[PDB]
Every structure is written in structure tokens, then in C-alpha cells.
Design a protein around this ligand. Structure first.
Ligand SMILES: NS(=O)(=O)c1cc(C(=O)NCCCO)c(Sc2ccccc2)cc1Cl
Ligand SMILES: NS(=O)(=O)c1cc(C(=O)NCCCO)c(Sc2ccccc2)cc1Cl
Ligand SMILES: [Zn+2]
Ligand SMILES: [Zn+2]
Lengths: 251, 251
């Protein structure tokens, strides 16, 4: 499979034709306020520098694989282990977030993928309700170089080639996310890539993370994808809510 | 295992000492209203008179086995199939509901147990989030004979004996449940019996169903269990919420 052409994803995986797909356009006017939605809890995200992590250009994204012991809770009894994070982005003067807010697409988006602690493996959790949980944050232009992002973006040159990987020191993974863990939208959707299995709990932060213009250009301009194509515009079109209600942790 | 004797539930299953157990005390004033909680959808519950259904005194409760094709949804893409229903009850001058409301114990309680259609087997669903869902309704004393409950209360004589079972005509399972499918409480907890597996979605109707004082005396006074004992007060003690917030489908 690939972005911007064949094969049609439903041919790869029927779930890509499901009624309840991700990503979605967030219209906060139609969001349901749910005061049961408490601030997210992250444990073990502050890593020591050794052992190193693997950062990989997989031709669809840049993925950092996370070590065991990163625990995330969406709430009491809603417990997850972090697997990996990856990015979705655009191209020179084109935004590439997956989620939109009232039709606004942001420059880029981070996804931190988690596995429910009731499941040993992702293949066992695919299509099960709440089996997988993704923390999603928009990346926007700010005036300062983001030093946590710089540790990954400074290494993209080494992994320019599709299927390339490199080792990076452990860092504070939580410094790649917004500091406000209180304000977020939450809905049930799918993987945004094949096999597009449903049952995924999506948390999209209200607060955005700030990268420099130069950092956003490094992300969109450095990596190569399938064939001789630049790895750019690696986002799925917005999918209808089809009667799902996005909840918000704030009125 | 048995009610209020030995062995020690945590020795039978140590999951009975878990942090997110059922039943709980419902405090409606502290429930979080979410407009995402839509009316319960129960299709195929109006069963024909044939085939008959198994009703069994298992020493813990009276259990009615349910046929295939009883479909239930808690929300978009969150579908279930009904497996069985059973009851919890008290004794002479003593209520026996499992759930309480503001510390009040109701005379009795009906549970309709369901399996997520994302799991082929109950043993895969046990201990997985949303694997099992129970619909729960309080039984209260009203002045009239309840027609729906008569079909079961009038067959308890034939199964007074621990481990006894009879066959009963098909009945409208949906007629056992309260009036308003839009008004309920919901939280995530456990089996209230060993093995006390967590990940159960509990849906507790706001409205009660009414039985005659006769009907209630019958339920609590006709069955025998643990050896030479009357089957009575077959409810579990109140479990702490441990930070869980009960949701409400109405403001
Ligand atoms: N965008 S997402 O909904 O958060 C998402 C993306 C990926 C994923 O890594 N896709 C490939 C490109 C990114 O590295 C995976 S897991 C995986 C699935 C198929 C193939 C390989 C891995 C899980 C999720 Cl929930
Ligand atoms: N009270 S309850 O949490 O609703 C409950 C009770 C029982 C149970 O039948 N034992 C108690 C008395 C029965 O007549 C089961 S049985 C079962 C079904 C599928 C999987 C595992 C167990 C499941 C549940 Cl959710
Ligand atoms: Zn993604
Ligand atoms: Zn029960």
C-alpha cells in the first residue's frame, strides 16, 4: 500500500472500508463535553540515554520504536503500554496533519501508539474495542527550535533512504507531546493506515507542540519513500464521523 | 465457591482482590452526564414460544440460557450478543440487589450477560476491556403481579434442588427490562462472582421494574443451594470505585 495511489486500501484490507474510520474533522461545537475524561497519566516516559532506540524510515513515516515499561492511562482501569511513535506531514507550504479542526489542517501530527495491558500483542488487539490507544498532537510553527524534536530531526539525514534506520539515545518521550494533558478530544476510530482496524481510542490534545520553521522543513524535505518519490503528504483524507460523537474533556 | 462462607474468593480467584471490581454504590449526583451515551439498541429479544430455553438452579442463582441472535449495541460499532440472564436477591425483611443507589439496596437485581461480537469465544473476552457487557436492572415491590417475571418465578418450584434444571417456553426477554432505554448509568468493572475478571461494561438502568411482594417472596424463598441451605442473599458486598467515574446517559 502507499499514499496518493493504488492499490485501493479496501483491496489491501476490507476494514479500510469500515463505517468508523480515522482520522476525522473535529468540530468542537458538535463535541460532547464529558467530565469523566480526566487528565492522561504517563509513567516511565523519561528514558535514560542507554539503551538506544531505533528510528526508522519505513517509507510511510519516520517511526521511533519504544522500549518496554512506558505506561499510559486514559483513566482509572484504562491502562496501556507505549509501542512506538511516528509522524504525518505535508510539503513546502502544504500542511499534513491527519486530523483537522473545523477543516483546518495543521503542518504535522505526532501519533504515540499504545497497546492495552489486557493484550500481549498488537495482532491480538486489532479490531477489539479499546485494544489500541493513540495519543495525537498537532505540530505548529513556533519561534524556538524544539530541543526534544531536534534529537530525532537531526538524525533524518542518516535515514533519508526508504527502509533505512539508525540508533538514537533515550530521551524524555513526554517532551514530544504538549505539556497540557487535561484538555483533549476523544473518540473511537481506526488505524489511519492499513489494515485500518476499528476499536482504536483516539485522544487529540487541545494544546499544540511548537517546532521551528527549519524543523518543519527538515521533517518534510529529508526522507524518501516508495520508488524515487519524496516522503511527503503522508496523511489519510478525513473520514466521516457517521454518527459517532467526539467527546471533549472541557466545555 | 459460595456466598458469605468459604473458601475466600481471592483464593478461588485472586482477581476478586483487583482494584476495579463490581458491584459499586451508584451516586447519581456524582455521575458524569455524557450526551455520547445513546439509547440502548436490543434487537431479536422477542423470542418465539419454540424452541424452549434452559432454566437452571446452579446453587449460586437461577440462570436462563439465551439462544443465538439477541443483538445489543452500547454505541456505534460496539455490538454484543446475549448469552444468559440470572438474578440476585435477599431474604425475609432483607433486600439483595448487588448495585446500591446512595447506599440503598433494592429487593433484587437482574443481569443480562453479553459477549462482544469482536471476540469469537468467552475465554478470549474474559479480562479484556469491553469483552463482556451486562445490562442490570433493579427489581422493586409494586402493587401488581409482573407478567414477564411470572414466566420464571412460576418455574422455581420445579428446580428448588441445587443443580436441578427444567425447560421453559420462549419469552420476550426485553419485557424483563425497564421502560426507558435512554436513561442508564455505565462504568467498567468485573464479574460479581469468581473469577471476578475485570473489563466488564456495566449498564444499570435508571428506572426499576416492579414485582408483587408475593413474586419477591417466591424468588428469595423457593431455591436451595450450598448443600442444605436456602439460596438467599446471593449478592456480593459493595466494591470501591477507586477513582472510576460512573457515567449517566441523561443530565
Ligand atoms: N496512524 S496510526 O493510526 O496511529 C497507526 C499507525 C501505525 C503505523 O505504524 N502505520 C505505518 C506507518 C507509520 O510508522 C500502526 S502499527 C502498524 C500498522 C501497519 C503496519 C505497520 C505498523 C498503528 C497505528 Cl494506530
Ligand atoms: N453477576 S455477573 O457479573 O453479571 C455475572 C455472573 C455470572 C455467573 O453466571 N455466575 C453467577 C450466578 C450465575 O447464575 C457470569 S457466568 C459467565 C459468563 C461468561 C463468562 C464467564 C462467566 C457472568 C457474569 Cl458478568
Ligand atoms: Zn499515525
Ligand atoms: Zn449477576
Amino acid at each position: 500500500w502507499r499514499y496518493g495511489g493504488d492499490p485501493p486500501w479496501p483491496r489491501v484490507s476490507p476494514a479500510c472500508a469500515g463505517r468508523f474510520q480515522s482520522p476525522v474533522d473535529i468540530r468542537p461545537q458538535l463535541a460532547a463535553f464529558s467530565p469523566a475524561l480526566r487528565p492522561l497519566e504517563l509513567l516511565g516516559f523519561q528514558l535514560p540515554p542507554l539503551p538506544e532506540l531505533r528510528l526508522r524510515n519505513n517509507g510511510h513515516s519516520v517511526q521511533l520504536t519504544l522500549p518496554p515499561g512506558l505506561e499510559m492511562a486514559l483513566g482509572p482501569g484504562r491502562e496501556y503500554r507505549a509501542l512506538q511513535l511516528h509522524l504525518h506531514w505535508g510539503a513546502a507550504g502544504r500542511p499534513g496533519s491527519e486530523h483537522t479542526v473545523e477543516g483546518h489542517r495543521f503542518p504535522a501530527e505526532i501519533h504515540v501508539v499504545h497497546l492495552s495491558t489486557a493484550f500481549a500483542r498488537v495482532d491480538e488487539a486489532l479490531g477489539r474495542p479499546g485494544g489500541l490507544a493513540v495519543l495525537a498532537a498537532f505540530l505548529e510553527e513556533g519561534p524556538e527550535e524544539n530541543s526534544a524534536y531536534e534529537q530525532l530531526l537531526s538524525r533524518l539525514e542518516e535515514i533519508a533512504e526508504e527502509g533505512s534506520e539508525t540508533q538514537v539515545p533515550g530521551l524524555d518521550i513526554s517532551a514530544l507531546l504538549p505539556s497540557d494533558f487535561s484538555r483533549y478530544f476523544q473518540y473511537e476510530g481506526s488505524l489511519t493506515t492499513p489494515p485500518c482496524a476499528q476499536g482504536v481510542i483516539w485522544t487529540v490534545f487541545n494544546q499544540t507542540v511548537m517546532l521551528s520553521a527549519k524543523q518543519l522543513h527538515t521533517l518534510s524535505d529529508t526522507l524518501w519513500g516508495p520508488g524515487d518519490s519524496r516522503l511527503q503528504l503522508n496523511f489519510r483524507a478525513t473520514q466521516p464521523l457517521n454518527g459517532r460523537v467526539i467527546e471533549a474533556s472541557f466545555p
